[PDB]
Write an enzyme that holds these catalytic residues in place. Structure first.
Site: not given
Ligand SMILES: [Ca+2]
Ligand SMILES: [Cl-]
Lengths: 242, 245
Positions: B98, B230, B50, B53
């Site tokens: 997302s 993350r 993602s 995007k």
């Protein structure tokens, strides 16, 4: 229409002060305030005028983009953050008056007046210094009039380029997290009675936008943090923000 | 101290502390210098998942598939696992949560020919979109490394990509993640969960008053339970280097 909620007055009197908060629910086209009379009372905008001043400087080319560097003129002023180089983002963030006075001088009285009439900005009266009329001159604007102007900006409806409006809304960014985004500008009218502090802008939610404009009595600088603190108290109490 | 890229293995302690492994890549824009804990993995290409995007948004805007950040993409009424997907969205909220199905529809409308031409102009990764036109960034052929993400993001920051300035400003608005009196973060998360090696991504930049710090990190992600690492590991590095307080 407008709803008056006098119970919100406690948010000011509990801090030994007086003021107005104005909220606008964009989805429902509904306004709320603690004091209709003061919500429509017009005051000097002080540094909230940096919103229209930025738009005019960009649309006319006085400012090329949000990265152009305005070099410090070497004169040491009282607020330390002013005594350094700035771009549009940091000049808004630290409310750097001298940078914006130079903008206004370069715009000129004639073009400034034409643009403020097109914006329908307050009483559209720039008498006084070309470079300080929003601090000690004749321009006056009310909290409800601030909402009307901000709504036009939010929707790219002002008679300046779309690009200029997108750049100023970037430069207004104040706070963001996973619950909300605040775009806003502070002001402090400290020369002409009644001395007041301002906070105007809006809160972006996933599903809606809440516009706001507040001002409060500000006899000294000690209370400046109450501009944002009082506003957030109200937003939290009403379940607009957590 | 003049090297373009400098390896700093002390950042590995942040991975070791969380029983994890991966790479953080930083770029100091003012000094035009880069820093990483693992030069080899910094240049290893993976599915973007993602994080794609960002380019997908740019292409849809520039072709008019998306008019602007207020256009509403109605929920198709199919209930999927992530509850925030099961509702109407615009570009701002589709990026935030997302929302894969929204961007799969974008890709179908863009089509393989125009998608390929745009990624070629962007010089994005191996520029290979074999697989479904609608899922090639999740389980197809496209691969991009962390350093390559930096380079691409730097182009976006300076409005140097070949699409309009307006499209680039809108996507940078939609990337807004966090802002306060100390910093602004514009970024996008990713989770490659179909094809080994399963990894998580966070790419973007940190705006300061007088500088910008670009970042791209990925890390091994054998299950979804570690996804918060993350941002956490990225922020631990940013704090060690005094970029954020
Ligand atoms: Ca312009
Ligand atoms: Cl923004």
């Amino acid at each position: 229409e407008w709803q008056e909620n006098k119970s919100w007055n406690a948010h000011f009197t509990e801090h030994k002060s007086q003021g107005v908060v104005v909220l606008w629910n964009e989805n429902k086209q509904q306004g709320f305030t603690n004091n209709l009379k003061r919500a429509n009372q017009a005051f000097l905008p002080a540094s909230t005028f940096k919103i229209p001043n930025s738009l005019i400087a960009l649309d006319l080319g006085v400012v090329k983009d949000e990265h152009q560097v305005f070099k410090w003129d070497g004169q040491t002023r009282d607020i330390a953050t002013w005594n350094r180089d700035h771009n549009l983002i940091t000049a808004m963030k630290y409310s750097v008056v001298p940078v914006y006075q130079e903008f206004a001088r370069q715009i000129g009285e004639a073009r400034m007046s034409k643009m403020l009439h097109a914006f329908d900005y307050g009483n559209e009266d720039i008498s006084g210094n070309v470079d300080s009329f929003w601090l000690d001159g004749g321009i006056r604007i009310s909290a409800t009039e601030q909402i009307s102007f901000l709504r036009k900006l939010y929707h790219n409806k002002l008679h300046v380029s779309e690009r200029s409006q997108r750049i100023v809304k970037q430069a207004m960014l104040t706070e963001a997290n996973g619950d909300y985004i605040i775009r806003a500008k502070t002001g402090y009218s400290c020369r002409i009675e009644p001395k007041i502090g301002w906070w105007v802008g809006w809160v972006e939610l996933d599903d809606n936008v809440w516009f706001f404009a507040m001002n409060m009595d500000m006899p000294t600088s000690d209370g400046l943090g109450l501009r944002q603190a009082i506003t957030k108290e109200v937003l939290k109490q009403e379940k607009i923000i957590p």
